[PDB]
Design a protein around this ligand. Sequence first.
Ligand SMILES: [Mg+2]
Length: 301
Amino acid sequence: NFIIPKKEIHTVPDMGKWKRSQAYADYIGFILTLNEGVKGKKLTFEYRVSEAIEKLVALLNTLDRWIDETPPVDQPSRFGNKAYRTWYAKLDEEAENLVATVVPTHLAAAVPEVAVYLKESVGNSTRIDYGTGHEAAFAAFLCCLCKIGVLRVDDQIAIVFKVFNRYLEVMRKLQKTYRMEPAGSQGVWGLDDFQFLPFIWGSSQLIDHPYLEPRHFVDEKAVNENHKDYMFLECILFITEMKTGPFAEHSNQLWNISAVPSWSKVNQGLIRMYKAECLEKFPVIQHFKFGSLLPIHPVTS
Ligand SMILES: [Mg+2]
């Protein structure tokens, strides 16, 4: 019964149907299961890589190549570069064909439904911005693939370390290349100007790390020397290379979070925060789309 996912959160009370939905249960369960799976593991951990995973990475690589083939254009506006729209148009048109390389031929009926999440995961073509809402769309895309059997429990680490990790690299390229802006006012009140999940999964990786403590993520040397093994630090590296000045000024929430004593507390706290700043934040999550795979109907077992 695959169907094109559509918006269901129109009023504030709908935040309640969302919270009670199968979609919410499956989504948070997905986020938390992966969180558990990557706990205490470096990005170079030896996890199994399935054909679907390689196809997902290939999909992201195509996206990446398209960025290279679509250079920023000179323009008067000093915000998002309009070439982003040229790049996005490619994804918008080819989304299903791309997803078809990942989903098996006999489950082609699921491709249009799944592809919607992919189209909603790389930013907004109107303002040329990106926020946690788009990131959540990518997580939903992945969650849908699990529900139809493309990704299994055995792929949980790869989903974060390989697929989501590659996705973040492409997003950073998009953000830098097209001078994208943070969605809404996320640049002010959000944990980070663009992402959130990597901070959750990334902090999970670092739980009980023998040396690295949250205070080290604002330590440039620690970041510079370990980012390739830890998603959380890679995010910080992106911040340091793009921004100038003290974290207290340009990344206040993260500056404050660095004062939290343990990665365990960072992870638990970020999960709560994620639900508060993203999943329970009407302005952000209202654009979530619901279909058959992530349905709005109350959760059942
Ligand atoms: Mg900010």
